[PDB]
Amino acid sequence: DEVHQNQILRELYLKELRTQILYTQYHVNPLRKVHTIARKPMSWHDNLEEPEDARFLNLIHHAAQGPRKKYPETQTESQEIGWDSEPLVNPARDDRRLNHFRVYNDITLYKAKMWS
Amino acid sequence: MREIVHLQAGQCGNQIGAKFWEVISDEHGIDPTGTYHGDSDLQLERINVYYNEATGGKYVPRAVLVDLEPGTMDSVRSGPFGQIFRPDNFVFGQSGAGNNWAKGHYTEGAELVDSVLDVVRKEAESCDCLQGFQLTHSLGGGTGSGMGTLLISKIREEYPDRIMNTFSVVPSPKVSDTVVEPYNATLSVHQLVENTDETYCIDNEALYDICFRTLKLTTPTYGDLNHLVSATMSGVTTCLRFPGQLNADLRKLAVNMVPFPRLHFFMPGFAPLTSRGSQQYRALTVPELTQQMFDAKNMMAACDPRHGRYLTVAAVFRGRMSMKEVDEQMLNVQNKNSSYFVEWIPNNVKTAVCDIPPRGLKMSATFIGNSTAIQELFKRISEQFTAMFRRKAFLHWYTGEGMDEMEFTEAESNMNDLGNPVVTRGAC
């Protein structure tokens, strides 16, 4: 019976039309899933220079901003490693008195271009 | 730049043409009075496809609104966009319709239709390169069928190089507002088949089904029922009014989209259709458009697509949008729907993308489909016609106007003869 099916749907639409709440105009954008289009090179559709979002401009810079100068804690056990990534008191390690790094001399300058 | 001459036959045709002009004047920025108040200059660079430019900076529609009963022209001119039409094209006529095909095709429809030709040839000629005509009408009932089929037959012979978009309201199985409607439908199909190049059948049941099951309306009115059709209309003709990439005109859609000279009966679809409650709940993207495009609820002819293979499918998109989501997702549609696509026509889906969408939207997509599921209109008129004529009732009117019995039999023979190729393509 269509005459009753339409009535029960009508009751349903009255339900959401008297109780539906709008999304209250915030546009919270995720900072990790954005992928875009490229505009045509000469055209009057495009190159009209719409203005930007300064919140997006400093918010991408806030997301690409490092975990230390980000989160003022050690949020995960993975942020424990590399956190205090500045070295300790000055290595002064160009002094070869106690420093024994290899150095590339002319034989190895010539050698690195062999074979390949 | 091209033109389109736009014909309205019948009450239904006049009304859906009025809603057409409403929606595309919204798209083109013209007020009730004719004066342009727009925002972008891309909206009048090709204003002369549907609008003749007139002095004073106001543009008037290029159309004729023909009906055999002099009330619907008054209704249209009293409508919201009433003071927009040329009163020379308000072709009225004082007679009785009687929802008849003989009274529009063998009787005073003949005396009116040459005045129609006289008043349509003026704007059909005041053009640079017109591409064709859009007749809006309905098979069921009179005027739009009686005037319509004869007008199509005259204009196709007299302009033999023009695309003929006839958007036609085919009957519903659950209702019809005409008892002699099977006679009207089978006598209109015979004229439509060796004439029109692109006829688009829309079935009122599937028009109602979107209003509840998809649009989630409350009290659907014929304004909204025509509004969906007019949205499809603007979707079909959009590359020529607004520019973009892969521009598709009527000829390019036709050469792609009708395979054989007989197989030009079409089923449309418009499918960014969102409920007022669920619009905020949508995540509007192109793969989400395509599922609603190919779903069996936004197809406006009452046919389940699972009853037959698609011959060819066209998709015309609107809005600025990358084409990976067009091209790859069209391939995904064709891949999973493998048995619903024919094997003898590989890669049978077209593509068009215009840059500017309809106003109030961000992406749009109009679907065009030619399948073998036209049986569920045509055999589903045929059984009523054969049980409708075997009794030889409802017929003395027709044979009294100038009709005779035999050309009914050849009309039925041709209409069920249409079924045989569009049976054989189903099973290859």
Place this chain on the structure above:
Amino acid sequence: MREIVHLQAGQCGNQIGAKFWEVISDEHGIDPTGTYHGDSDLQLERINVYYNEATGGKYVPRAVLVDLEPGTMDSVRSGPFGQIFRPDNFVFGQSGAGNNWAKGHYTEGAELVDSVLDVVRKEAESCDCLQGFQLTHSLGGGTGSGMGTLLISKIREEYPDRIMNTFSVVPSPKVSDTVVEPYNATLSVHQLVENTDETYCIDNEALYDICFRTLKLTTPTYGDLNHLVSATMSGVTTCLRFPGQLNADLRKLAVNMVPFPRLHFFMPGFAPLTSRGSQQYRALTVPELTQQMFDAKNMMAACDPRHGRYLTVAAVFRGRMSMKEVDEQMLNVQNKNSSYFVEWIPNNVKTAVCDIPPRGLKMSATFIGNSTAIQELFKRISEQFTAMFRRKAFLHWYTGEGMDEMEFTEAESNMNDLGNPVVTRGAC
């Protein structure tokens, strides 16, 4: 990325999933209207697992809400976090299940399972990787037992390689709310055994024992008794929602927790659970967490593990902590309690450590058990079924709706077959 689609049947499981959604939206920091008012970005790192993204940051639960009586969906719509789901996902039914499995499987429920399959399908393809489906239903009583047994039967034939999490409230020792709960339960387990990959049996009187004996609450209701269950399915899918250490998703658990394909009936538990008055005297560390999670008064099922043998034990820890205590007390419980663990499966404790803890704590532990003590629970409904079935009572409508005695006999025979394996594992 990984995801779980949430199937929500019955009235019991309807409110189960309802209270599940406030818990995980509060965990992710979601406003009732769908706005993200967050504090940490780790909530938005992996939020595409239960909350599909829409425009404007409109996050929607990927749940479907099925019930054959259309009053509980009205209740959950009118609830606090009710204006957040998809209205198309609110699948309604205009009939009465009437606490009948026959009417939940062989009737209007089977008329609605096609629409339920359509909406769960449309939720499935709008992604790329499906870990599986998490449904909440009632193992005793109608609707959700019938909906669960038909729905998993369809989904396993549809997607045959994904994870099924069946959260079921088993019929109850002291009380019971439907006369035919043994009838529904026996042949609900009959479908549950060869279909589902991971099954959580939660006993109601176990929940009442937790809220009274351990929590010392004065007037608990279905809200907070529902919330305790909400926490213990929020815990299991957490390494897949937050960055984890030795992280473990549902299959990672299922492979190492079920030894045999049919012994997939589990024992959930969440246990940093403290009485209000004694919360101030608590000394929250991993050892006292271990004592409380392996103490069988915070167990979600009223099945004493002292009356049987553990097969496998899982511990989804969450929080900021060191972990020699985690492993040395998973060693120490094995050393101290040795007879309760099977010798053919030694070192039989999976442990996972998600690093992001729930709000209110900074360590939690979802304890999961697979023991031989499920057998007292399976038997007691088997003898209740035989007592109700010997005299052929409460059964005439079950036969009249389209079943025979043969199906009931095969159901009792299949739980008698379940009388074999985990009993033989009890004595090796």
Place this chain on the structure above:
Amino acid sequence: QRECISVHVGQAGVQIGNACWELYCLEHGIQPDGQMPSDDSFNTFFSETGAGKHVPRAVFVDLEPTVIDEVRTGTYRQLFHPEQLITGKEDAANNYARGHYTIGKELIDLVLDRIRKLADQCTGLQGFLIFHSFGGGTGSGFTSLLMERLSVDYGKKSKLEFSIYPAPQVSTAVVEPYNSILTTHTTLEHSDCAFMVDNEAIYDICRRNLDIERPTYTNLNRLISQIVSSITASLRFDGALNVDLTEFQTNLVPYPRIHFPLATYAPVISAEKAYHEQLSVAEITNACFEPANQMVKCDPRHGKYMACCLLYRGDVVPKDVNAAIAAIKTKRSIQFVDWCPTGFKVGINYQPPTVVPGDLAKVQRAVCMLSNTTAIAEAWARLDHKFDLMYAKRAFVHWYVGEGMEEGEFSEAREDMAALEKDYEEVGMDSVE
């Protein structure tokens, strides 16, 4: 002094010119208006006209409006000569009959006159860069009519098609393996060389390297523009090895019948990836021969290379080139023909690849590897498999028959392309005599 005329036919050709001229103007110093702020350089593509402007040596032509009116409206309007841009009146509508036979005749006269007028102020003409597709009617039939007329009128001059190959798997048109099969019957004898590009290869390249998940045809046409930019670079600037279009025509094409080579661009790196590779000449050369950066979806491992030219532009040390070539010639994955031992060309240019604001990064070395391989036999069989089934019961043929075209030329289209497949299988066989 050393100039070649660029013709852009059809919507695909108009849009790849839409990318290539804006790339060329940033290569050189030409502003949008046409004026250069202030040696020779520009003459090959940009003709100086007394006032300070650098008007293109281009004919943008298409049977339909609405794509070149945007050239006549957009930012670069003051740059183009207002009659270099040619449009007809209506769409040729994916029909080779409407591209060649009936509506081609009012446009071929005007467009050939415009070619003559552009070539009048041309002293040293290497040839023609014709940019079109194997898809629509404008891209196929008008291209065929143009190359027939150009073989009649400029019969000795070099012609290079930059053809848009039909997508082998996905497509955007349905009567493409009719229009393509005819245009490759007709332009076969008349085209001196046909560098061949499809769509889905750029789709995959931008997916896997540029990390763009929905690039568009602007993104496709920009990389095609970089390809044509690198191919016409030695006749623009000075370098170590100088190589031109006549030499490409002579040595990338072994036989009069086999003139269908393929491109491959090198680094297509995407700004936040170029800090992590050396961008050495060796790995740049290897990335061209990897069968994942290939410009058409055919497998080079399913075939054999006949001849390849490598156009190293940028800071290329003149002997890393053949260090890399000696590395490639020893691998047993890149199989060459046994009848062509010497098959490599080196062309070194000192001009670094420029970058427009977009997706590509500032790269100081690049190569457009151009190879003529037998792997196009698979692509041609794959396109002919679309054609045999559709011609088996006369699908779509009524438009072609009724629009002036005669029905029976599909037959020798099939015969001619069967001959092309036979020529491929005769040239791919190892010599035993």
Place this chain on the structure above:
Amino acid sequence: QRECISVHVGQAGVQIGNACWELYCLEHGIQPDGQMPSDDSFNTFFSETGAGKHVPRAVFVDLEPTVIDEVRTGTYRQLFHPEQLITGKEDAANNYARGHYTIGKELIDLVLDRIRKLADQCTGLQGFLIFHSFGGGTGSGFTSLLMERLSVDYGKKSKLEFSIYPAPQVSTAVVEPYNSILTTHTTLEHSDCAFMVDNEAIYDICRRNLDIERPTYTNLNRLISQIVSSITASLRFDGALNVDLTEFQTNLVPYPRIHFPLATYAPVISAEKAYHEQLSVAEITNACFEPANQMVKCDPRHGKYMACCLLYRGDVVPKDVNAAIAAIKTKRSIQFVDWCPTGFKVGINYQPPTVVPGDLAKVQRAVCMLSNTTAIAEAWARLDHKFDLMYAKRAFVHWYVGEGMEEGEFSEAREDMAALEKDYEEVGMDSVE
């Protein structure tokens, strides 16, 4: 020049690899990003992109995300090439059949392509340091699948594994013994040398010597990072004895089968504990051969040492080490095999280990001890016993057989394990002929 490729499979692989690269960056001078603040030494691990960015020769691979999303979010996201870090979309779920048979083909080709790119970029490819575990499916099955492909491609190269052995009393999974027996069955014939690092001995040494009560896996992993940094140190530094990667390999194995050394570290002490003893080279040697600091929980008194490589770093007088070896050889508690009297291999490196901010002490000397012992035979025998016990009645077998693995591969692993256990006692028995 002299470089080795570090590839890390599994979550354990990623975490010990994070410890490794964190130690290497501060050891060299590299910042958290690729940059060098205001000589050859980086070349062993870090390549050199221009303007001071250094790219690690690291391939971090896991079948599951979030452990690489960890890396791409943390403060080393700029250090690595983002396409070197390889992620799947489906966790192996603690199953060898998933790690080797069902989810292996969506990633194995890309991992081998990245390894091939790094091997081409590397001049002298000395060898590979793979980092995995004998535990979970991701660390076991994909490493197993990696071995045959990498040995087919690069069979003349050297292979060092760093694996987490299943714990002697605790463990973490119920199918760690299954995955352990299967992965050693497949990696026994193809692995070149595999340094076992059992998990529980880490806990015991951190409880005793470090005197610390809150170490997590990062603290347990930085010890292993120090071990591998000491191992591949003379490849990078100046010293007295220059030990090479092939030199480790030719010394630590007696037979073509016995390739499971046991390592340990000396100075494992914790800063506010080292103010109170020598750390002199005799005690440096003796603390390694004390059965309380070995990194694998098996007591060497029920075993016989075969060969021991000692790697001393720092102020190590080259003759006091000979004095310490002479002192430790005469002790009756430490017993060797009768077919190898010369057992202690000295490697001397001149500069002290660099301290990470954390728990380990900056100590002026440090030896890593590398013993091939028969005490690991009991651990292998107990893993065999556990496999028999849980394979007695097909427990946890239906998942593996449904995920593509065949049942008899379990028996093949068992038979080869019986063969390996037999070979242990056959080489451990004293000769009497």
